[PDB]
Amino acid sequence: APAWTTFRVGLFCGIFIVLNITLVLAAVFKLETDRSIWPLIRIYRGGFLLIEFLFLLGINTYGWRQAGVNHVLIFELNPRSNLSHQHLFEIAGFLGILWCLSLLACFFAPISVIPTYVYPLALYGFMVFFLINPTKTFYYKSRFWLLKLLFRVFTAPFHKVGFADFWLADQLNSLSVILMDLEYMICFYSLELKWDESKGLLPGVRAIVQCIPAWLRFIQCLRRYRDTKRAFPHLVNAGKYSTTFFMVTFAALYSTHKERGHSDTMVFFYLWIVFYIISSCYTLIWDLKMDWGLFDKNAGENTFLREEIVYPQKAYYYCAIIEDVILRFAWTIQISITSTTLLPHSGDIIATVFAPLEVFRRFVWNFFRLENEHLNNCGEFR
Amino acid sequence: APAWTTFRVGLFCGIFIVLNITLVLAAVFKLETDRSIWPLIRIYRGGFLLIEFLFLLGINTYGWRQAGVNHVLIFELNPRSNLSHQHLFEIAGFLGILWCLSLLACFFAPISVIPTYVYPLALYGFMVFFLINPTKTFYYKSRFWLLKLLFRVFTAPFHKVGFADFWLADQLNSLSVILMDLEYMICFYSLELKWDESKGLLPGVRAIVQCIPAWLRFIQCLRRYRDTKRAFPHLVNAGKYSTTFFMVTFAALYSTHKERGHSDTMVFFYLWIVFYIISSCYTLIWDLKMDWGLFDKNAGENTFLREEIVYPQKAYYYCAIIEDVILRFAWTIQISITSTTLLPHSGDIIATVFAPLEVFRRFVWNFFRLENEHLNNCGEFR
Ligand SMILES: CCCCCCCCCCCCCCCCCC(=O)OC[C@H](COP(=O)([O-])OCC[N+](C)(C)C)OC(=O)CCCCCCCCCCCCCCCCC
Ligand SMILES: CCCCCCCCCCCCCCCCCC(=O)OC[C@H](COP(=O)([O-])OCC[N+](C)(C)C)OC(=O)CCCCCCCCCCCCCCCCC
Numbered sequence: 001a002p003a004w005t006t007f008r009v010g011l012f013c014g015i016f017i018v019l020n021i022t023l024v025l026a027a028v029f030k031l032e033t034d035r036s037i038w039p040l041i042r043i044y045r046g047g048f049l050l051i052e053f054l055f056l057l058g059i060n061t062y063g064w065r066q067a068g069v070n071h072v073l074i075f076e077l078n079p080r081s082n083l084s085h086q087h088l089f090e091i092a093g094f095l096g097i098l099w100c101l102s103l104l105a106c107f108f109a110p111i112s113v114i115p116t117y118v119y120p121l122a123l124y125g126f127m128v129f130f131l132i133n134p135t136k137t138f139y140y141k142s143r144f145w146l147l148k149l150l151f152r153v154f155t156a157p158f159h160k161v162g163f164a165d166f167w168l169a170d171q172l173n174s175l176s177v178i179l180m181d182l183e184y185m186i187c188f189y190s191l192e193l194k195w196d197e198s199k200g201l202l203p204g205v206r207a208i209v210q211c212i213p214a215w216l217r218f219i220q221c222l223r224r225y226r227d228t229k230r231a232f233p234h235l236v237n238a239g240k241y242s243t244t245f246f247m248v249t250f251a252a253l254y255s256t257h258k259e260r261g262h263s264d265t266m267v268f269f270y271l272w273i274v275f276y277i278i279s280s281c282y283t284l285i286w287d288l289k290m291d292w293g294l295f296d297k298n299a300g301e302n303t304f305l306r307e308e309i310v311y312p313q314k315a316y317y318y319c320a321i322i323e324d325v326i327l328r329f330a331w332t333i334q335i336s337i338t339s340t341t342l343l344p345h346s347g348d349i350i351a352t353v354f355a356p357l358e359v360f361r362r363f364v365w366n367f368f369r370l371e372n373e374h375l376n377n378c379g380e381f382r
Numbered sequence: 383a384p385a386w387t388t389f390r391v392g393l394f395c396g397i398f399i400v401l402n403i404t405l406v407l408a409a410v411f412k413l414e415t416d417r418s419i420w421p422l423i424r425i426y427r428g429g430f431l432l433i434e435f436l437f438l439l440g441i442n443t444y445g446w447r448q449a450g451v452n453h454v455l456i457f458e459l460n461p462r463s464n465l466s467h468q469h470l471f472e473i474a475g476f477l478g479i480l481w482c483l484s485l486l487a488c489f490f491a492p493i494s495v496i497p498t499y500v501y502p503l504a505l506y507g508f509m510v511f512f513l514i515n516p517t518k519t520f521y522y523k524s525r526f527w528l529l530k531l532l533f534r535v536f537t538a539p540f541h542k543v544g545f546a547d548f549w550l551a552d553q554l555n556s557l558s559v560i561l562m563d564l565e566y567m568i569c570f571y572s573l574e575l576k577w578d579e580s581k582g583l584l585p586g587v588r589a590i591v592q593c594i595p596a597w598l599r600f601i602q603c604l605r606r607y608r609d610t611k612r613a614f615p616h617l618v619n620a621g622k623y624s625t626t627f628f629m630v631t632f633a634a635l636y637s638t639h640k641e642r643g644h645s646d647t648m649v650f651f652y653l654w655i656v657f658y659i660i661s662s663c664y665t666l667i668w669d670l671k672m673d674w675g676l677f678d679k680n681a682g683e684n685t686f687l688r689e690e691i692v693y694p695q696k697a698y699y700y701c702a703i704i705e706d707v708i709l710r711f712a713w714t715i716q717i718s719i720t721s722t723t724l725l726p727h728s729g730d731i732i733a734t735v736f737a738p739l740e741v742f743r744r745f746v747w748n749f750f751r752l753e754n755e756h757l758n759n760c761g762e763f764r
């Protein structure tokens with residue numbers, strides 16, 4: 001940990017703190033709130049979730065290093081080349097600085113003659129320009145590794161599945177708001193935002209892309225079964241993600257039929273609720289029994305846990321075992337609403353509230369998934 | 383050195399940067415015409431000068447440590463404690479955050495219950511408390527050492543003059559603007575206007591208190607003469623400092639006669655010129671021959687600097703040689719402008735601009751004074 005790295009982490013943290021306080025003060029005072037600020041939130045939500053995700057990844061790396069979780073071999077990373085938690089903190093802080101500057105610029109855009117709607121385009125553009133940059137300048141090894149992993153995950157079950165592929169696929173599974181906001185921005189720029197007015201706020205296509213983080217993980221499990229000849233450990237989760245498929249399909253059908261007004265809509269409404277049950281159990285039980293490795297009968301002196309515990313405090317587990325549940329249902333509803341458009345009111349706000357909560361659920365999922373992989377070696381990755 | 387100290391350094395630096403830009407923006411887009419403004423600048427100039435002095439002194443300590451200068455032994459400093467440059471940067475950042483918060487509070491007109499003028503009282507108050515806290519915490523050893531040095535300096539004739547005493551008493555010579563603003567604040571809160579009002583409102587002696595940083599240095603080198611009976615290195619230095627008394631006295635007499643109209647006028651002005659010349663040379667040559675030990679003949683391959691060089695780049699020396707020359711006169715300018723009326727138009731602009739320039743010039747002088755002390759035992763401090 002170089003001293004300049006810690007200085008940069010602290011610098012970006014302080015700048016981000018003061019800029020966020022300035023942002024909330026400007027929103028309270030300088031924001032008119034009479035020009036549909038919701039598209040602004042729906043555009044910046046992807047960046048906010050990404051920055052939160054990177055910061056929580058830094059926390060996860062610190063937790064693994066302190067708790068003895070040898071994630072270096074698990075991720076198949078080079079032992080002499082790793083991105084320590086301070087680097088993730090620095091990247092998150094820098095991206096947060098850019099995000100806050102963009103938001104502040106958008107709030108009082110008359111600061112410059114450039115239109116109010118050109119700030120996010122730069123930010124995400126800069127974001128993309130930070131991800132793809134051939135010059136070996138800013139974490140070139142890390143960005144190139146991430147690009148290889150992104151290509152391997154996103155394409156198809158054409159590559160042998162290692163730990164990094166599955167893990168990033170799951171991270172994208174818990175971060176679908178990024179893809180949904182990408183589609184929303186594309187629709188905004190294609191149908192609205194005439195480009196003539198300086199106001200960037202203004203006075204079934206989503207359903208299929210909603211399943212992309214799940215389609216990339218269902219075919220991955222199918223490929224794993226094909227290459228491993230083990231029906232249970234892969235086909236059960238294949239069905240688990242098929243439950244997400246069915247949930248999204250029935251949400252879309254229910255929304256369309258409610259718009260059509262047919263009585264059969266009510267039937268489909270029931271057809272939604274039941275799936276909202278099974279998914280919220282299928283994604284829950286499979287997560288608590290064989291994903292984390294808890295509720296084991298051979299719990300020994302412990303309760304609801306396993307006999308090999310490496311975290312300093314046992315209560316940390318139990319909160320999660322509750323917290324995950326409290327958030328798991330909170331995830332399953334979200335996946336529906338953004339793909340349903342059922343609620344003209346109180347839908348977008350609740351999705352925006354729940355999205356960082358689901359990112360937090362995925363953050364706490366890593367803490368125990370990597371612990372289980374370190375000890376149990378679950379998943380057959382060696 | 384500790385990672386958390388570096389993190390705090392970065393955090394405080396970032397908060398100070400963001401709050402400083404916020405202050406600049408507020409000053410541009412606030413402060414309606416009827417605000418006096420200049421009294422606030424006069425009040426907060428002392429605080430800004432102290433913060434800048436601490437920051438530049440951290441820079442100086444880093445420079446000495448990297449250049450091989452054993453400032454630990456020169457300052458008669460114990461090997462224990464001995465705070466590094468990061469600690470000075472942290473103190474400067476924290477004090478700057480407090481200063482920026484106070485200044486922004488006075489700018490932004492907070493809740494109309496607690497009047498604004500209490501904010502400068504608190505800020506400086508805290509700094510006073512930050513020095514006079516009896517509890518063994520918050521750099522207690524360093525603060526106690528500074529308190530003892532302040533007591534020894536302000537009672538200079540009755541104490542043996544060590545290196546630390548002279549060094550601090552000479553820093554006060556460049557920092558006298560803080561004392562000037564403190565006396566101005568005393569007069570303003572005690573006599574000018576009334577404290578029962580709100581906002582900034584509508585838009586001898588002093589010479590004596592101004593000469594105090596030069597009086598405490600003129601009294602030394604007389605004590606050193608009494609102890610050593612060496613007329614050259616001390617009595618000549620004493621005359622160098624007495625040039626300040628002569629120049630300020632002539633400035634005060636000139637201004638008083640111009641205001642009263644005793645027809646002497648230019649009779650003093652000519653005097654006020656020549657001493658303003660003589661002092662501006664008497665000090666200047668000293669800095670280049672007695673302090674830094676430059677222009678040393680028979681140096682060798684070095685062009686008119688010295689035999690032994692400890693700093694990596696010689697050009698810096700030459701830069702300083704110019705800089706001092708163009709800011710040693712400037713120091714004599716402001717030190718006369720603040721002392722009395724002189725030019726009535728603006729005037730405070732020149733003082734407010736030159737005071738940080740004087741602090742910077744003293745910051746430059748520190749490098750080469752301590753280099754000379756390290757190389758050749760100057761002042762017989764041993
Ligand atoms: C005072 C208020 C309460 C505390 C602040 C709470 C902030 C929110 C939670 C932050 C968690 C901080 C824990 C980090 C992990 C442990 C670090 C540690 O051990 O410190 C020692 C480490 C040093 O590394 P070390 O642990 O190896 O210690 C050195 C060990 N030896 C001596 C063996 C070498 O210190 C740091 O690196 C400083 C921590 C910096 C991170 C602080 C927060 C950064 C914020 C990022 C920007 C915001 C982006 C947006 C965020 C969105 C989501 C919220
Ligand atoms: C089109 C959508 C594509 C996917 C969605 C966007 C990306 C989502 C996933 C981001 C992954 C972040 C890190 C995951 C892996 C962490 C593993 C780890 O600990 O290693 C640290 C990793 C890699 O470190 P490493 O140590 O593994 O690398 C060393 C490599 N070896 C050992 C081989 C030498 O660090 C990073 O990946 C950080 C750099 C990337 C930071 C993010 C840059 C921007 C990315 C694109 C943003 C998209 C903008 C648009 C979205 C919003 C629109 C509304």
Ligand SMILES: CCCCCCCCCCCCCCCCCC(=O)OC[C@H](COP(=O)([O-])OCC[N+](C)(C)C)OC(=O)CCCCCCCCCCCCCCCCC
Nearest residue numbers: 002003004007395398433434437441444468471474475478
């Ligand atoms: C790049 C342009 C910046 C312009 C902004 C204005 C600042 C001007 C340049 C500042 C230079 C400061 C660094 C020199 C000293 C440290 C050198 C070094 O190597 O240390 C690195 C140290 C860490 O290294 P270290 O000193 O532990 O030694 C090296 C250790 N290893 C080997 C592990 C690397 O980090 C710092 O201290 C970073 C500098 C922090 C302070 C930077 C200034 C910001 C503003 C200060 C707060 C406000 C003050 C108020 C006054 C305002 C001005 C009038």
Ligand SMILES: CCCCCCCCCCCCCCCCCC(=O)OC[C@H](COP(=O)([O-])OCC[N+](C)(C)C)OC(=O)CCCCCCCCCCCCCCCCC
Nearest residue numbers: 428460462463464465506509510523524525527528560564
């Ligand atoms: C009347 C007001 C006059 C003007 C204000 C006076 C300010 C004095 C500033 C001098 C500080 C620097 C001293 C030497 C530092 C360099 C030497 C070194 O390397 O050692 C580090 C030194 C000593 O550190 P140390 O770790 O070596 O500790 C000594 C070690 N033993 C005891 C073992 C020998 O550091 C300091 O002295 C720093 C102390 C903190 C800085 C002061 C902060 C508060 C100042 C408030 C002033 C009051 C307000 C003024 C009014 C404003 C207008 C109204």
